[PDB]
Structures are given as structure tokens and as C-alpha cells.
Amino acid sequence: GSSGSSGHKEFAVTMRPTEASERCHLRGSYTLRAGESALELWGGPEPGTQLYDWPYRFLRRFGRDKVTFSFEAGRRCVSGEGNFEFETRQGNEIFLALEEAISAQKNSGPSSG
């Protein structure tokens, strides 16, 4: 942390109406976070655990919109395939974070122990 902050950057999002969300039958607002290998999303009671963490590798494509941030989830996922939408303005960050990791894992050689 020579510049300022490396990680630990969460983003408040709201469950919006979507074909996918429907199946999930979600309600309320959850927390959005970007991990190293997969995505992070807390919801349960404190402290909390990652249950919606989607594996980037699977994420074929994704897009961020100042108005709303969404992405395309593949198959064989906890939540399921479809298009999820998150209510946030700083979405720009959320996206970048993902790329940062996807690029990092490669930036450095093969992680061993």
C-alpha cells in the first residue's frame, strides 16, 4: 500500500428486477466485492460468507454502466445463468477490480504454494 489502497473496496448494490434474479428470488440489497480468483458478495448475517461468488474465468463477458453494472454469468453456477443487474453509481470501480485480478493472475508466473 505505497500508493493508497490495494483492496478491501466494497460497493453497495440493490437487487433489481431481471429475468435471472427472478429464479434466485432475491430481495433487498447486497454487498458487491471483487476477489482474486472469483467474485465476492456478502449477504448472510455477520460476519458473512461468499455464497454468490462467481468465478470470473466462467464470466464470458461483462459490462459496467454509470447507471447500472451488470455481467453475463455462464452455466453450472450457484446462482445460475442469466443477466444480473446491480444498482450502483461507482460501478466503474467494481468492473476495473475484476479486470485487475484477471490480468494479475497472469501478470505473475504460476502461483505455487
Swiss-Prot record:
Highly expressed in peripheral blood leukocytes, lymph nodes and spleen. Lower expression in thymus, bone marrow and fetal liver. It comes from the Eukaryota. Residues 8-107 form the IRS-type PTB domain. Belongs to the DOK family. Type A subfamily. Interacts with phosphorylated RASGAP and EGFR. Interacts with RET and NCK. Interacts (via PH domain) with TEK/TIE2 (tyrosine phosphorylated). (Microbial infection) Interacts with Herpes simplex virus 1 (HHV-1) protein UL46; this interaction induces DOK2 phosphorylation and subsequent degradation. DOK proteins are enzymatically inert adaptor or scaffolding proteins. They provide a docking platform for the assembly of multimolecular signaling complexes. DOK2 may modulate the cellular proliferation induced by IL-4, as well as IL-2 and IL-3. May be involved in modulating Bcr-Abl signaling. Attenuates EGF-stimulated MAP kinase activation. PTB domain mediates receptor interaction. This is Docking protein 2. It comes from Homo sapiens. The gene is DOK2. The chain holds residues 148 to 247 of 412 of the full protein.
